[PDB]
Amino acid sequence: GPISPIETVPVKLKPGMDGPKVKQWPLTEEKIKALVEICTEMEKEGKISKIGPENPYNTPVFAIKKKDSTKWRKLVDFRELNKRTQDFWPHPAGLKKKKSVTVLDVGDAYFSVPLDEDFRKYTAFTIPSINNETPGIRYQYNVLPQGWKGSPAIFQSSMTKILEPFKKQNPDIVIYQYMDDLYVGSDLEIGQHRTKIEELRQHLLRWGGYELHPDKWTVQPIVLPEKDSWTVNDIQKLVGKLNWASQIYPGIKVRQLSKLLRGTKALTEVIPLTEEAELELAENREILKEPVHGVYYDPSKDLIAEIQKQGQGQWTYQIYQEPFKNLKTGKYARMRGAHTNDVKQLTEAVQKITTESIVIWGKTPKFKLPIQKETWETWWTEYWQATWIPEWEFVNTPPLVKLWY
Amino acid sequence: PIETVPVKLKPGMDGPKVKQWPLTEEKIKALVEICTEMEKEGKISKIGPENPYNTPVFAIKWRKLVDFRELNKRTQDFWEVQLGIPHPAGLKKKKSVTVLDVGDAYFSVPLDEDFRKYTAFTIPSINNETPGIRYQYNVLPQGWKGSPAIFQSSMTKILEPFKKQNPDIVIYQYMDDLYVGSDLEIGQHRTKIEELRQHLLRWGLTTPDQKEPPFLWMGYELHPDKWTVQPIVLPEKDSWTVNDIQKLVGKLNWASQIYPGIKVRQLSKLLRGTKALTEVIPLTEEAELELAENREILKEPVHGVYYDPSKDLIAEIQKQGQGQWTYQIYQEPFKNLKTGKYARMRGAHTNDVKQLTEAVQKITTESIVIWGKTPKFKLPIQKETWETWWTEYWQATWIPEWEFVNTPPLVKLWYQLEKEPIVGAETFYVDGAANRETKLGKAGYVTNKGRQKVVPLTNTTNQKTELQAIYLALQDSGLEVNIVTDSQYALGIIQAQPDKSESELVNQIIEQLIKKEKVYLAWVPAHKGIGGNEQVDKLVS
Ligand SMILES: [Mg+2]
């Protein structure tokens, strides 16, 4: 296309790092057709340009449909490129406390600012063909691409000039920008909320949603099943669970409870609690209410979110930065695909945990998923409805104890 | 007339400088013939001694053969755009079909002018004192690293205006062959064919004079209502050179995408050498069996039919002998589009349900490759068996919409551990221990009813003494038993719920679990205050 009139910023990759060289995964006929229609129009508008095989870099590309959406949207898997891109040069702590927060897709705006020439070769992607009838169609971005971490950083100043007449007339509203998404939160009534976000939407169209309520987000604490009549199995499960909790709270003790299990008894034999055993169980009950020592959010380190399948459509999750120091614990239930699809529920869990982590800390976690690599890589794109993609690892070790019920 | 593709060597690396072998009189004579004939065509140009680069050239039959391995080692990487090769089952029935071959494919796509310096080669000096001629390539040389990708890209950018100007015909291009399919009347189809050949001829691409039903395309025969892969013939030779071995691994790794169970590993192992492209090679017996059994599997005739997008894809799976599965993809009953075998049994513990899931996911992936859609499955497993499995499995797992087909042997769950401790059942606190020094150990259990047992063991590890303790608990208990262990290893193996294993101890534990009625396996932390675990531990201590 034509040389963009806006002067370009000189971007570069991390020192010593080369561009991404990731292979394209197979795509359905529907998504290939959608990406052909999208990328042809994008090539006509000068946003992307065809390249040859001399470009040794590639980035996966596919298409998604958002919630209650019938239109395909192109999603490029810029995860490796974002990992290899240089970090640039704040997250509002007030956003998490607002009653209503709307997410708007402002990635299209990025299509108005050109991308650095010497950097364009790193944004190469290839649209595959069914049955390899024709060789894949390769493009590179001449403009700030959606899903790249550099696009919002470079478009930040322009966005500030776009939103100043809305930011000073309404200083109560909180605005945070992450990747292709804009989060606008407030404590206002929902009717005024729709009107104000429509106001900002037209304000965006003069230059040219997805609603959440974070103050209703619940935590899931460590609860001890405290019954009246105890079988041997219940007490040994409790001793294992508190022996596991003793790494989070070093004050936990399991001595007087373990003394009840003395001798070789049947697992279903009822055991009466002693006096110091009930006292110690109550003490350990309250030590779990004390905050964990040394816990705090470090933006310089990565967030890690582990997910556990609990059956009957409920899934627990933990967000921490180092073991046993959980910034947030929670549980989900009655999601899409409940009681008939584990991959869909796990995908929706990843999306919810990611959205919450962006609202709270302004960054996506790295996920430990309870699924084989092949299954997740086989079906996860069929249910993805977000414009960002977090990195994930695969856990194949069965948990001895659930620990979050 | 084609615009060239920019080519650059790897960073900080100059062109190649390989000494040229002097050959005999006859080889040189033929090389001067073929090389002059190639200089009459614009393919190569004579260069003065200003060029310091050289590439070895030989002469086998005549036929010229250039060794570009060093130049390829110094040429930049190129992105392989294709995800594989086209499968004939993905072809839709067309009223008119024509397959064209590109004559002198590489030798008609120009090479980057700045890169030709590195394509320099010498014809060896035959002697009283006669000269060796020095050529450089003006075109993509055969065997060069970047020739396939650049030729494919140039062919695409040449065909695109014609494919847009002719939407009624479809063109699938790959290597030597162009597939032109159409539903037009055969006359208009022929006219479009000639338009395509004139279009290619304007760019300097000739195509010498397939019009007959046996359309050979990518080693396939495209009959009107079916397709059959051409039987691949492998050479039977007393002595192998190194060029024939690399060519053979080319055709074998090519044949891998159409045949299952064809391996090139030990043959590819013999490509790490400094030897030139003509020296004799000793053939390892591993490569001997590798070429033998592969040469036997290529005798299997593979056939199928074409794809009808108006119907759905059906994928049926069947259980075989040893971790083997068979699958058929068809749209009409028994008219298979593609059949195949899946061979995987985990080197660790596994079960049939996991293997079935992996098969479903793999054939789903290749089905999206060939047809871009996921087929409806027919699997030898009951609905309640699957429901119990995925609902009770600790990992997230799922398979697409399917229907049960009663094709023995059925996939079953051979045992199911219970969720709660069993009232009235015997409780076995098990433990084991061993010493690395004396390679001797003990495995035992204690029981609420006072029953206990300790067995001394040779050729056992600690993690094996734990499994041995669980095994002894299963042997000496009734049909309902609760087992308490302190080993996350053994319990971690049992929680994966396998039905077969390489370790015969694990397999006997599996049989003991199948013969039981109720088994509740619990875990307690080791070396803490704990009722029976410290007892059996003190015994095995
Ligand atoms: Mg022990």
PDB file of N, CA and C in Angstrom, chain A residues 22-24 26-29 53-54 58 130-136 138 233 258 261 263-268 309 315 339-342 370-371 374-375 379 383 395-398, chain B residues 5-6 76 78-79 81-84 86-87 90 149 152 163 172-173 361 364 368-370 372 390 393-398 400 422 427 429 446-448 491 495 520 529 531-532:
ATOM      1  N   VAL A  22       6.940 -19.516  14.333  1.00  0.00           N
ATOM      2  CA  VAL A  22       5.941 -20.485  14.768  1.00  0.00           C
ATOM      3  C   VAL A  22       5.148 -20.961  13.560  1.00  0.00           C
ATOM      4  N   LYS A  23       4.879 -22.263  13.508  1.00  0.00           N
ATOM      5  CA  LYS A  23       4.143 -22.845  12.397  1.00  0.00           C
ATOM      6  C   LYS A  23       2.650 -22.569  12.528  1.00  0.00           C
ATOM      7  N   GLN A  24       1.979 -22.494  11.383  1.00  0.00           N
ATOM      8  CA  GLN A  24       0.539 -22.284  11.352  1.00  0.00           C
ATOM      9  C   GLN A  24      -0.182 -23.609  11.568  1.00  0.00           C
ATOM     10  N   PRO A  26      -3.645 -26.108  11.523  1.00  0.00           N
ATOM     11  CA  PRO A  26      -4.768 -26.252  10.588  1.00  0.00           C
ATOM     12  C   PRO A  26      -5.990 -25.469  11.048  1.00  0.00           C
ATOM     13  N   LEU A  27      -6.722 -24.938  10.073  1.00  0.00           N
ATOM     14  CA  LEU A  27      -7.911 -24.139  10.321  1.00  0.00           C
ATOM     15  C   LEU A  27      -9.098 -24.729   9.573  1.00  0.00           C
ATOM     16  N   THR A  28     -10.287 -24.536  10.137  1.00  0.00           N
ATOM     17  CA  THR A  28     -11.501 -24.987   9.478  1.00  0.00           C
ATOM     18  C   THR A  28     -11.752 -24.176   8.208  1.00  0.00           C
ATOM     19  N   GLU A  29     -12.612 -24.721   7.344  1.00  0.00           N
ATOM     20  CA  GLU A  29     -12.947 -24.032   6.100  1.00  0.00           C
ATOM     21  C   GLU A  29     -13.632 -22.700   6.376  1.00  0.00           C
ATOM     22  N   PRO A  53       8.788 -16.002   0.402  1.00  0.00           N
ATOM     23  CA  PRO A  53       9.369 -16.962   1.349  1.00  0.00           C
ATOM     24  C   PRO A  53      10.703 -16.526   1.933  1.00  0.00           C
ATOM     25  N   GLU A  54      11.307 -15.449   1.423  1.00  0.00           N
ATOM     26  CA  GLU A  54      12.568 -14.969   1.976  1.00  0.00           C
ATOM     27  C   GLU A  54      12.417 -14.451   3.400  1.00  0.00           C
ATOM     28  N   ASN A  58       7.227 -16.184  11.033  1.00  0.00           N
ATOM     29  CA  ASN A  58       5.809 -16.462  10.862  1.00  0.00           C
ATOM     30  C   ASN A  58       5.132 -16.424  12.222  1.00  0.00           C
ATOM     31  N   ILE A 130      -7.300 -25.241   2.609  1.00  0.00           N
ATOM     32  CA  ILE A 130      -7.836 -26.580   2.825  1.00  0.00           C
ATOM     33  C   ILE A 130      -7.053 -27.566   1.975  1.00  0.00           C
ATOM     34  N   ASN A 131      -6.663 -28.690   2.580  1.00  0.00           N
ATOM     35  CA  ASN A 131      -5.970 -29.783   1.891  1.00  0.00           C
ATOM     36  C   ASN A 131      -4.747 -29.299   1.110  1.00  0.00           C
ATOM     37  N   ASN A 132      -4.211 -28.130   1.464  1.00  0.00           N
ATOM     38  CA  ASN A 132      -3.032 -27.570   0.801  1.00  0.00           C
ATOM     39  C   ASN A 132      -3.238 -27.473  -0.709  1.00  0.00           C
ATOM     40  N   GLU A 133      -4.459 -27.116  -1.118  1.00  0.00           N
ATOM     41  CA  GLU A 133      -4.744 -26.940  -2.540  1.00  0.00           C
ATOM     42  C   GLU A 133      -3.785 -25.931  -3.158  1.00  0.00           C
ATOM     43  N   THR A 134      -3.734 -24.730  -2.589  1.00  0.00           N
ATOM     44  CA  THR A 134      -2.769 -23.714  -2.962  1.00  0.00           C
ATOM     45  C   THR A 134      -1.850 -23.423  -1.783  1.00  0.00           C
ATOM     46  N   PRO A 135      -0.602 -23.034  -2.035  1.00  0.00           N
ATOM     47  CA  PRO A 135       0.271 -22.618  -0.932  1.00  0.00           C
ATOM     48  C   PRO A 135      -0.355 -21.471  -0.153  1.00  0.00           C
ATOM     49  N   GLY A 136      -0.107 -21.464   1.155  1.00  0.00           N
ATOM     50  CA  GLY A 136      -0.666 -20.458   2.037  1.00  0.00           C
ATOM     51  C   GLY A 136      -0.377 -19.036   1.601  1.00  0.00           C
ATOM     52  N   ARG A 138       0.723 -15.435   2.445  1.00  0.00           N
ATOM     53  CA  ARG A 138       1.527 -14.794   3.475  1.00  0.00           C
ATOM     54  C   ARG A 138       1.365 -13.281   3.421  1.00  0.00           C
ATOM     55  N   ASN A 233     -10.981 -41.971  58.493  1.00  0.00           N
ATOM     56  CA  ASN A 233     -10.623 -41.436  57.183  1.00  0.00           C
ATOM     57  C   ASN A 233     -10.746 -39.918  57.153  1.00  0.00           C
ATOM     58  N   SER A 258      -3.421 -36.161  65.250  1.00  0.00           N
ATOM     59  CA  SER A 258      -2.801 -37.415  64.846  1.00  0.00           C
ATOM     60  C   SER A 258      -2.770 -38.427  65.984  1.00  0.00           C
ATOM     61  N   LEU A 261      -5.561 -40.945  65.950  1.00  0.00           N
ATOM     62  CA  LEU A 261      -5.513 -42.020  64.972  1.00  0.00           C
ATOM     63  C   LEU A 261      -4.642 -43.182  65.422  1.00  0.00           C
ATOM     64  N   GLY A 263      -2.810 -46.475  66.797  1.00  0.00           N
ATOM     65  CA  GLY A 263      -3.222 -47.824  66.491  1.00  0.00           C
ATOM     66  C   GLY A 263      -3.721 -47.969  65.061  1.00  0.00           C
ATOM     67  N   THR A 264      -3.914 -49.216  64.673  1.00  0.00           N
ATOM     68  CA  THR A 264      -4.358 -49.543  63.326  1.00  0.00           C
ATOM     69  C   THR A 264      -5.872 -49.743  63.374  1.00  0.00           C
ATOM     70  N   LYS A 265      -6.609 -48.716  62.969  1.00  0.00           N
ATOM     71  CA  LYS A 265      -8.063 -48.719  62.995  1.00  0.00           C
ATOM     72  C   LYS A 265      -8.630 -48.724  61.578  1.00  0.00           C
ATOM     73  N   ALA A 266      -9.881 -49.168  61.469  1.00  0.00           N
ATOM     74  CA  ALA A 266     -10.579 -49.128  60.192  1.00  0.00           C
ATOM     75  C   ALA A 266     -10.862 -47.687  59.782  1.00  0.00           C
ATOM     76  N   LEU A 267     -10.935 -47.463  58.468  1.00  0.00           N
ATOM     77  CA  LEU A 267     -11.109 -46.105  57.961  1.00  0.00           C
ATOM     78  C   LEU A 267     -12.466 -45.524  58.337  1.00  0.00           C
ATOM     79  N   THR A 268     -13.478 -46.369  58.509  1.00  0.00           N
ATOM     80  CA  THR A 268     -14.829 -45.915  58.805  1.00  0.00           C
ATOM     81  C   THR A 268     -15.153 -45.941  60.294  1.00  0.00           C
ATOM     82  N   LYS A 309     -10.129 -29.200  38.222  1.00  0.00           N
ATOM     83  CA  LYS A 309     -11.472 -29.683  37.919  1.00  0.00           C
ATOM     84  C   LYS A 309     -12.060 -30.366  39.147  1.00  0.00           C
ATOM     85  N   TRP A 315     -15.094 -25.593  39.000  1.00  0.00           N
ATOM     86  CA  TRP A 315     -13.647 -25.584  38.819  1.00  0.00           C
ATOM     87  C   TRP A 315     -13.038 -24.562  39.766  1.00  0.00           C
ATOM     88  N   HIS A 339     -21.405 -29.916  32.451  1.00  0.00           N
ATOM     89  CA  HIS A 339     -21.857 -31.303  32.483  1.00  0.00           C
ATOM     90  C   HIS A 339     -21.866 -31.964  31.112  1.00  0.00           C
ATOM     91  N   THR A 340     -21.210 -31.375  30.112  1.00  0.00           N
ATOM     92  CA  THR A 340     -21.145 -32.008  28.801  1.00  0.00           C
ATOM     93  C   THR A 340     -19.872 -31.654  28.042  1.00  0.00           C
ATOM     94  N   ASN A 341     -19.091 -30.704  28.550  1.00  0.00           N
ATOM     95  CA  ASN A 341     -17.882 -30.278  27.850  1.00  0.00           C
ATOM     96  C   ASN A 341     -16.890 -29.738  28.870  1.00  0.00           C
ATOM     97  N   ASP A 342     -15.770 -30.441  29.047  1.00  0.00           N
ATOM     98  CA  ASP A 342     -14.740 -29.968  29.963  1.00  0.00           C
ATOM     99  C   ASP A 342     -13.822 -28.950  29.301  1.00  0.00           C
ATOM    100  N   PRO A 370      -5.381 -28.389  33.939  1.00  0.00           N
ATOM    101  CA  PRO A 370      -5.489 -29.846  34.163  1.00  0.00           C
ATOM    102  C   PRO A 370      -6.013 -30.575  32.932  1.00  0.00           C
ATOM    103  N   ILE A 371      -5.169 -30.672  31.904  1.00  0.00           N
ATOM    104  CA  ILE A 371      -5.573 -31.265  30.635  1.00  0.00           C
ATOM    105  C   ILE A 371      -4.322 -31.709  29.894  1.00  0.00           C
ATOM    106  N   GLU A 374      -2.451 -32.413  23.993  1.00  0.00           N
ATOM    107  CA  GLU A 374      -3.032 -32.689  22.683  1.00  0.00           C
ATOM    108  C   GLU A 374      -4.508 -32.313  22.629  1.00  0.00           C
ATOM    109  N   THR A 375      -5.271 -32.644  23.674  1.00  0.00           N
ATOM    110  CA  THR A 375      -6.699 -32.333  23.683  1.00  0.00           C
ATOM    111  C   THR A 375      -6.938 -30.827  23.669  1.00  0.00           C
ATOM    112  N   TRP A 379      -8.877 -28.529  20.725  1.00  0.00           N
ATOM    113  CA  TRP A 379     -10.208 -27.932  20.789  1.00  0.00           C
ATOM    114  C   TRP A 379     -10.275 -26.513  21.342  1.00  0.00           C
ATOM    115  N   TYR A 383     -13.567 -22.482  21.050  1.00  0.00           N
ATOM    116  CA  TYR A 383     -14.353 -21.816  22.077  1.00  0.00           C
ATOM    117  C   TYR A 383     -13.754 -20.498  22.543  1.00  0.00           C
ATOM    118  N   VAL A 395      -0.636 -29.684  33.185  1.00  0.00           N
ATOM    119  CA  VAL A 395      -0.383 -30.471  34.384  1.00  0.00           C
ATOM    120  C   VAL A 395      -0.921 -31.871  34.129  1.00  0.00           C
ATOM    121  N   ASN A 396      -0.054 -32.873  34.277  1.00  0.00           N
ATOM    122  CA  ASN A 396      -0.431 -34.269  34.096  1.00  0.00           C
ATOM    123  C   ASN A 396      -0.317 -35.088  35.375  1.00  0.00           C
ATOM    124  N   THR A 397      -0.063 -34.450  36.517  1.00  0.00           N
ATOM    125  CA  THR A 397       0.044 -35.164  37.780  1.00  0.00           C
ATOM    126  C   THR A 397      -1.270 -35.061  38.531  1.00  0.00           C
ATOM    127  N   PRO A 398      -1.898 -36.176  38.893  1.00  0.00           N
ATOM    128  CA  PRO A 398      -3.177 -36.116  39.604  1.00  0.00           C
ATOM    129  C   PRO A 398      -2.988 -35.587  41.014  1.00  0.00           C
TER     130      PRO A 398
ATOM    131  N   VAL B   5      13.330 -12.824  -6.210  1.00  0.00           N
ATOM    132  CA  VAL B   5      13.136 -12.828  -4.762  1.00  0.00           C
ATOM    133  C   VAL B   5      14.471 -12.495  -4.102  1.00  0.00           C
ATOM    134  N   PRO B   6      14.518 -11.531  -3.184  1.00  0.00           N
ATOM    135  CA  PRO B   6      15.790 -11.198  -2.526  1.00  0.00           C
ATOM    136  C   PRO B   6      16.309 -12.362  -1.696  1.00  0.00           C
ATOM    137  N   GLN B  76      20.273 -18.407   3.847  1.00  0.00           N
ATOM    138  CA  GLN B  76      19.246 -18.080   4.830  1.00  0.00           C
ATOM    139  C   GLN B  76      18.153 -19.140   4.866  1.00  0.00           C
ATOM    140  N   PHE B  78      14.247 -20.415   4.787  1.00  0.00           N
ATOM    141  CA  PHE B  78      13.041 -20.021   4.074  1.00  0.00           C
ATOM    142  C   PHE B  78      11.844 -20.662   4.755  1.00  0.00           C
ATOM    143  N   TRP B  79      10.767 -19.896   4.891  1.00  0.00           N
ATOM    144  CA  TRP B  79       9.577 -20.397   5.564  1.00  0.00           C
ATOM    145  C   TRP B  79       8.831 -21.351   4.639  1.00  0.00           C
ATOM    146  N   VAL B  81       5.745 -22.762   3.458  1.00  0.00           N
ATOM    147  CA  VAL B  81       4.378 -22.260   3.526  1.00  0.00           C
ATOM    148  C   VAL B  81       3.372 -23.398   3.657  1.00  0.00           C
ATOM    149  N   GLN B  82       3.656 -24.551   3.059  1.00  0.00           N
ATOM    150  CA  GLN B  82       2.712 -25.661   3.070  1.00  0.00           C
ATOM    151  C   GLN B  82       2.715 -26.367   4.420  1.00  0.00           C
ATOM    152  N   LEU B  83       1.528 -26.789   4.855  1.00  0.00           N
ATOM    153  CA  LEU B  83       1.371 -27.610   6.048  1.00  0.00           C
ATOM    154  C   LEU B  83       1.534 -29.097   5.764  1.00  0.00           C
ATOM    155  N   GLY B  84       1.777 -29.471   4.517  1.00  0.00           N
ATOM    156  CA  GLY B  84       1.887 -30.868   4.130  1.00  0.00           C
ATOM    157  C   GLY B  84       1.699 -31.006   2.626  1.00  0.00           C
ATOM    158  N   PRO B  86      -1.229 -32.249  -0.527  1.00  0.00           N
ATOM    159  CA  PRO B  86      -2.662 -32.472  -0.747  1.00  0.00           C
ATOM    160  C   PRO B  86      -3.004 -33.952  -0.781  1.00  0.00           C
ATOM    161  N   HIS B  87      -4.158 -34.283  -0.218  1.00  0.00           N
ATOM    162  CA  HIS B  87      -4.637 -35.658  -0.249  1.00  0.00           C
ATOM    163  C   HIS B  87      -5.748 -35.801  -1.284  1.00  0.00           C
ATOM    164  N   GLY B  90      -9.506 -35.289  -0.517  1.00  0.00           N
ATOM    165  CA  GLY B  90     -10.018 -33.939  -0.432  1.00  0.00           C
ATOM    166  C   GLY B  90     -10.490 -33.348  -1.737  1.00  0.00           C
ATOM    167  N   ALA B 149      11.048 -23.214  -2.527  1.00  0.00           N
ATOM    168  CA  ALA B 149      10.154 -22.189  -1.998  1.00  0.00           C
ATOM    169  C   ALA B 149      10.010 -21.019  -2.964  1.00  0.00           C
ATOM    170  N   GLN B 152       7.921 -22.070  -5.917  1.00  0.00           N
ATOM    171  CA  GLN B 152       6.503 -22.158  -5.581  1.00  0.00           C
ATOM    172  C   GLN B 152       5.880 -20.772  -5.454  1.00  0.00           C
ATOM    173  N   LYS B 163      -5.950 -17.153 -12.269  1.00  0.00           N
ATOM    174  CA  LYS B 163      -6.989 -17.767 -11.452  1.00  0.00           C
ATOM    175  C   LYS B 163      -8.101 -16.779 -11.128  1.00  0.00           C
ATOM    176  N   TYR B 172      -4.669 -26.219  -8.495  1.00  0.00           N
ATOM    177  CA  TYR B 172      -3.912 -26.611  -7.312  1.00  0.00           C
ATOM    178  C   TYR B 172      -2.491 -26.914  -7.770  1.00  0.00           C
ATOM    179  N   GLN B 173      -1.530 -26.092  -7.359  1.00  0.00           N
ATOM    180  CA  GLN B 173      -0.156 -26.250  -7.811  1.00  0.00           C
ATOM    181  C   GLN B 173       0.702 -26.841  -6.700  1.00  0.00           C
ATOM    182  N   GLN B 361      -8.635 -37.243  18.429  1.00  0.00           N
ATOM    183  CA  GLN B 361      -8.059 -35.916  18.234  1.00  0.00           C
ATOM    184  C   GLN B 361      -7.141 -35.878  17.018  1.00  0.00           C
ATOM    185  N   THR B 364      -9.210 -36.088  13.910  1.00  0.00           N
ATOM    186  CA  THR B 364      -9.845 -34.779  13.806  1.00  0.00           C
ATOM    187  C   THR B 364      -8.900 -33.761  13.185  1.00  0.00           C
ATOM    188  N   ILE B 368      -9.417 -31.936   9.600  1.00  0.00           N
ATOM    189  CA  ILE B 368      -9.455 -30.496   9.368  1.00  0.00           C
ATOM    190  C   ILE B 368      -8.407 -30.101   8.337  1.00  0.00           C
ATOM    191  N   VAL B 369      -7.302 -30.847   8.258  1.00  0.00           N
ATOM    192  CA  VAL B 369      -6.298 -30.572   7.233  1.00  0.00           C
ATOM    193  C   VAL B 369      -6.877 -30.822   5.846  1.00  0.00           C
ATOM    194  N   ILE B 370      -7.519 -31.975   5.658  1.00  0.00           N
ATOM    195  CA  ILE B 370      -7.926 -32.387   4.318  1.00  0.00           C
ATOM    196  C   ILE B 370      -9.243 -31.731   3.912  1.00  0.00           C
ATOM    197  N   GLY B 372     -11.216 -29.539   6.259  1.00  0.00           N
ATOM    198  CA  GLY B 372     -11.569 -28.346   7.005  1.00  0.00           C
ATOM    199  C   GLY B 372     -12.771 -28.480   7.909  1.00  0.00           C
ATOM    200  N   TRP B 390     -15.135 -39.553  31.656  1.00  0.00           N
ATOM    201  CA  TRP B 390     -14.810 -38.130  31.634  1.00  0.00           C
ATOM    202  C   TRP B 390     -15.385 -37.393  32.838  1.00  0.00           C
ATOM    203  N   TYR B 393     -12.841 -38.472  35.629  1.00  0.00           N
ATOM    204  CA  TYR B 393     -11.422 -38.228  35.406  1.00  0.00           C
ATOM    205  C   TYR B 393     -11.021 -36.872  35.980  1.00  0.00           C
ATOM    206  N   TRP B 394      -9.835 -36.817  36.596  1.00  0.00           N
ATOM    207  CA  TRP B 394      -9.421 -35.593  37.274  1.00  0.00           C
ATOM    208  C   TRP B 394      -9.003 -34.515  36.288  1.00  0.00           C
ATOM    209  N   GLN B 395      -8.678 -34.899  35.060  1.00  0.00           N
ATOM    210  CA  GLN B 395      -8.273 -33.978  34.012  1.00  0.00           C
ATOM    211  C   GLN B 395      -9.467 -33.633  33.132  1.00  0.00           C
ATOM    212  N   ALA B 396      -9.423 -32.443  32.545  1.00  0.00           N
ATOM    213  CA  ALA B 396     -10.446 -32.045  31.588  1.00  0.00           C
ATOM    214  C   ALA B 396     -10.260 -32.831  30.296  1.00  0.00           C
ATOM    215  N   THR B 397     -11.313 -33.517  29.858  1.00  0.00           N
ATOM    216  CA  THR B 397     -11.249 -34.274  28.617  1.00  0.00           C
ATOM    217  C   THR B 397     -12.621 -34.265  27.960  1.00  0.00           C
ATOM    218  N   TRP B 398     -12.624 -34.384  26.635  1.00  0.00           N
ATOM    219  CA  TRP B 398     -13.851 -34.284  25.860  1.00  0.00           C
ATOM    220  C   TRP B 398     -13.581 -34.779  24.448  1.00  0.00           C
ATOM    221  N   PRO B 400     -15.731 -34.934  20.439  1.00  0.00           N
ATOM    222  CA  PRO B 400     -16.896 -34.347  19.759  1.00  0.00           C
ATOM    223  C   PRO B 400     -18.088 -35.287  19.682  1.00  0.00           C
ATOM    224  N   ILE B 422     -14.973 -47.664  52.622  1.00  0.00           N
ATOM    225  CA  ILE B 422     -15.951 -48.746  52.621  1.00  0.00           C
ATOM    226  C   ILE B 422     -16.188 -49.201  54.055  1.00  0.00           C
ATOM    227  N   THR B 427      -9.128 -52.745  56.376  1.00  0.00           N
ATOM    228  CA  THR B 427      -8.261 -51.591  56.170  1.00  0.00           C
ATOM    229  C   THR B 427      -6.806 -52.040  56.236  1.00  0.00           C
ATOM    230  N   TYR B 429      -3.048 -50.757  55.995  1.00  0.00           N
ATOM    231  CA  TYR B 429      -2.017 -49.725  55.986  1.00  0.00           C
ATOM    232  C   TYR B 429      -0.749 -50.349  55.419  1.00  0.00           C
ATOM    233  N   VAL B 446      -0.106 -53.678  57.611  1.00  0.00           N
ATOM    234  CA  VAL B 446      -0.755 -53.997  58.875  1.00  0.00           C
ATOM    235  C   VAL B 446      -2.244 -53.711  58.710  1.00  0.00           C
ATOM    236  N   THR B 447      -3.057 -54.354  59.547  1.00  0.00           N
ATOM    237  CA  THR B 447      -4.502 -54.346  59.362  1.00  0.00           C
ATOM    238  C   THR B 447      -5.202 -54.127  60.696  1.00  0.00           C
ATOM    239  N   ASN B 448      -6.317 -53.388  60.654  1.00  0.00           N
ATOM    240  CA  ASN B 448      -7.103 -53.125  61.858  1.00  0.00           C
ATOM    241  C   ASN B 448      -7.519 -54.408  62.564  1.00  0.00           C
ATOM    242  N   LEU B 491       0.348 -44.250  44.466  1.00  0.00           N
ATOM    243  CA  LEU B 491      -1.001 -43.709  44.353  1.00  0.00           C
ATOM    244  C   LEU B 491      -1.147 -42.847  43.107  1.00  0.00           C
ATOM    245  N   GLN B 495      -3.905 -43.622  40.307  1.00  0.00           N
ATOM    246  CA  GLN B 495      -4.896 -42.593  40.014  1.00  0.00           C
ATOM    247  C   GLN B 495      -5.002 -42.302  38.523  1.00  0.00           C
ATOM    248  N   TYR B 520     -10.964 -48.654  47.824  1.00  0.00           N
ATOM    249  CA  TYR B 520     -10.793 -47.258  48.207  1.00  0.00           C
ATOM    250  C   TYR B 520      -9.336 -47.038  48.590  1.00  0.00           C
ATOM    251  N   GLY B 529       2.599 -38.235  62.706  1.00  0.00           N
ATOM    252  CA  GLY B 529       1.804 -39.055  63.594  1.00  0.00           C
ATOM    253  C   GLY B 529       0.657 -39.651  62.804  1.00  0.00           C
ATOM    254  N   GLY B 531      -1.798 -43.543  62.481  1.00  0.00           N
ATOM    255  CA  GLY B 531      -2.098 -44.820  63.102  1.00  0.00           C
ATOM    256  C   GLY B 531      -1.362 -46.051  62.613  1.00  0.00           C
ATOM    257  N   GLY B 532      -1.733 -46.556  61.439  1.00  0.00           N
ATOM    258  CA  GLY B 532      -1.168 -47.797  60.940  1.00  0.00           C
ATOM    259  C   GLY B 532       0.068 -47.610  60.086  1.00  0.00           C
TER     260      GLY B 532
END
